[PDB]
Write a protein that binds this ligand. Structure first.
Ligand code: HEM
Ligand SMILES: COc1ccc(CCNC(=O)C[C@@H]2CN(c3cc(C)nc(-n4ccnc4)n3)CCN2C(=O)C(C)C)cc1
Length: 304
């Protein structure tokens, strides 16, 4: 067998033009091929523009329409995503002009607000600046936009999310005030332009939770924070996205989500979202890759 790696690692230098150009050309072909018989002359013109931009600047910028197409095709190309059947239902937020961590935080607040929609969940992706030389990466160090902290007990058992024990310690190490509950929402840890990450508490009013029906509960919004979007040889190492829950196992239910009017992929929702998708009809690439946990690769500039 010849599987590919599902992981795309860091770089220390810009992608070589000899490697970048063929990938860009192939993506430009995929995009204009989505029109099939139209736009031959526009296709060729974009090819020339992209090629001269790469030759002059070492890289290129996607148009907004190309970016939107890319995020949706990468979604379509996600092997295990059940949601991908309605891939046209995706809202894109273009944050490619973002420069600071504070600005990242505001983009993410907007994303969480839009996607949560008081429970009527909408799928969205926010795209931060593409990798340049690999020394100025944007990254969310979180695995999810919303997730509970995990604390190790003296007996070896975990309080909270057992899967986040390491990340939770990192937050504490970064100065995050360690509460000790079973449902403490982790802070956003945000890296801008390759700098050391900064810690931002998520405004509590932005976190919608479903109370189970006892003591249990969970967050309504499943958002993956840590993957990298690849398209036309370009890499976007910060591109958080969300859908809604499957419900078959959230980790804490099907009644409680439905009761509090929080979207899950039940039969009604499956049918309606596919219906909405269908109405929009009026090496895989692009692709979402996993990355190496950034605290394992980051070179600390301040380390205080
Ligand atoms: C609208 C609701 C959505 C639902 C119900 C949904 C559901 C799922 C489920 C059940 C998984 C599989 C987990 C596993 O078995 O490993 C998954 C994986 C994934 N989803 Fe979604 N998803 C949705 C939206 C999205 C969106 C909006 C994107 C991105 C634009 C997306 C990208 C992915 C990716 C990249 C994976 C991992 C794929 C892999 O590793 O094979 N999903 N999703
Ligand atoms: C909303 O869809 C679901 C996502 C996660 C779950 C729980 C199962 N958990 C996982 O699969 C763990 C992670 C996180 N994971 C998540 C987690 C969250 C909160 N959300 C998503 N997701 C949202 C939209 N698409 C995917 N995906 C992706 C799959 N994961 C992997 O480790 C694969 C590499 C095997 C149920 C439904």
């Amino acid at each position: 067998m010849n599987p590919k790696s599902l992981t795309r690692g860091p770089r220390d230098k810009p992608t070589p033009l000899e490697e970048l150009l063929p990938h860009a050309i192939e993506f430009i072909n995929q995009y204009y091929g989505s029109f099939k018989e139209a736009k031959i002359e526009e296709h060729l013109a974009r090819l020339e523009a992209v090629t001269k931009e790469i030759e002059t600047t070492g890289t290129y910028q996607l148009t907004l329409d190309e970016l939107i197409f890319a995020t949706k095709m990468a979604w379509r190309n996600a092997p295990r995503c059940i949601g991908r059947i309605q891939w046209s239902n995706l809202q894109v937020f273009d944050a490619r002009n973002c420069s600071t961590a504070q600005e990242m935080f505001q983009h993410i607040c907007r994303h969480i607000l839009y996607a949560t929609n008081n429970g009527n969940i909408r799928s969205a992706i926010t795209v931060f600046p593409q990798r340049s030389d690999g020394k100025h990466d944007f990254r969310l160090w979180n695995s999810q936009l919303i997730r509970y902290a995990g604390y190790q007990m003296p007996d070896g058992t975990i309080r909270g999310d057992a899967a986040t024990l390491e990340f939770t310690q990192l937050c504490i190490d970064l100065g995050w005030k360690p509460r000790y509950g079973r449902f403490d929402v982790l802070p956003l840890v945000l890296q801008a332009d390759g700098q050391d990450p900064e810690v931002f508490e998520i405004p509590p009013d932005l976190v919608l939770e479903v109370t189970m029906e006892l003591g249990l509960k969970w967050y309504a919004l499943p958002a993956v924070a840590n993957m990298l979007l690849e398209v036309g040889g370009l890499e976007f190492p910060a591109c958080p996205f969300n859908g809604w829950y499957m419900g078959t196992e959230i980790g804490v239910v099907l009644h409680s989500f439905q009761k509090q009017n929080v979207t899950i992929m039940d039969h009604h929702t499956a049918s309606e979202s596919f219906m909405k998708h269908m109405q929009n009809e009026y090496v895989l690439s692009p692709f979402y890759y996993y990355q190496i946990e950034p605290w394992k690769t980051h070179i600390w500039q301040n380390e205080h």
